[PDB]
Amino acid sequence: SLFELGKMILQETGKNPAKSYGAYGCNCGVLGRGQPKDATDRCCYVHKCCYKKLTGCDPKKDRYSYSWKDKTIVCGENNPCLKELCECDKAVAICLRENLGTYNKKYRYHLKPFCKKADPC
Amino acid sequence: SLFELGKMILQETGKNPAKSYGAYGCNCGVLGRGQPKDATDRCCYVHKCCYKKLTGCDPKKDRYSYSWKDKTIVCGENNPCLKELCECDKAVAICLRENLGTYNKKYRYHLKPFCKKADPC
């Protein structure tokens, strides 16, 4: 759920997750996808494409178990949908962290209605 | 559009509008309505009910004319829908300013999927 996703983001990046990523660019946080603005935004595009397969569960609301072990996100076993979900969230948290060096605060609260349409996943 | 709405909020409150109100509580900013958390949130509930009464124009995307005159938001004539839209936005900007005294940062990045359902407008 958003709770685990947020915690992962914090653990990896060290940043307040909703502040930095709850509304970033055309793809991070709320709403759907859009033409990406930059690498941070692309992480979120990938993230939301990863979610598409998860028709058996709810990426926003469904809780799942993971642990932080040796500064690594380790998804707990669960049902396949929640496990895959956890792995989508792990991957975006790592990607956002990896791309902190080009994070641009001008995109932090991007006006998403004006984004151009995303390519299909 | 979101441009005029944010400019009004800034002019009234003196605060970065998307930072303080782009995702506040269950009603401010993205997505629809929800059970309000406090008076600031209720301003946005009213705002979104106001938008439902509009007749063809788009509150997110449609531009309109207004001026800041003697520290008052003055809606231009525009056309009927845009004029009404402008008045919805003026009302919420004023309301958010009026309720700065109980603004609670804990609601700034509220996780909206977990909000309880709003009453009908």
CA dist., res. A51 & res. A81, Å (int): 10
H or E element in which residue A73 lies: strand A73-75
CB A19 within 8 A of CB A6: no
CB A106 within 8 A of CB A23: no
Token code pair at residue B7 = 């400019």
Domain count, chain B: 1
> Among positive and negative, which fits the CA dihedral B47, A24, A59, B25?
negative
What is the residue range of B75's domain?
1-121
> Among positive and negative, which fits the CA dihedral B12, B17, B20, B26?
positive
Burial (CB count within 10 angstroms: exposed 0-12, middle 13-18, buried 19+), residue A118: middle
Rounded to 10 deg, the angle between the B2-13 and B80-98 helix axes is: 30
Which of A2, A16, A22 is facing B113, going by the closest CB pair? Answer: A2
Contact between chains at B19 and A114 (C-beta distance less than 8 A): no
Residue whose tokens read 């956890």: A86
Measure the N-to-C terminal CA separation of chain B; round to a whole number of Å: 21
CB B12 within 8 A of CB B97: yes
Beta bridge partners of B66: B75
Residue whose tokens read 């003196």: B14
Residue A24, classed as helix, strand or coil, is coil
∠ CA B116-B118-B121 to the nearest 5 degrees? 180
Q: How was this structure determined?
A: X-ray
Beta bridge partners of A75: A66
3-state helix/strand/coil string of B67-85 = EECCCCEEECCCCHHHHHH
One-letter amino acid identity for A117? K
CB B73 within 8 A of CB B12: yes
Q: Which residues lie below 8 Å from residue A104, measured CB to CB, with a gap of 6+? A: A37, A38, A40
CA dist., res. A9 & res. A6, Å (int): 5
Contacts of B22 in chain A (CB under 8 A): 23, 109
Burial (CB count within 10 angstroms: exposed 0-12, middle 13-18, buried 19+), residue B88: buried
CB A12 within 8 A of CB A94: yes
CATH of the domain at A34: 1.20.90.10
CB atoms within 10 A of CB B18: 19
Rounded to 10 deg, the angle between the B80-98 and B39-52 helix axes is: 170
Rounded to 10 deg, the angle between the A80-98 and A39-52 helix axes is: 170
CA dist., res. A2 & res. A28, Å (int): 12
Testing the interface with A: which of B111, B112, B114 to mutate, by most A Cβ within 10 A? B111
Residue whose tokens read 């109980």: B102
Beta bridge partners of B73: B68
Catalytic site residue A47? Answer: yes
CA dist., res. A25 & res. A45, Å (int): 10
CB B60 within 8 A of CB B2: yes
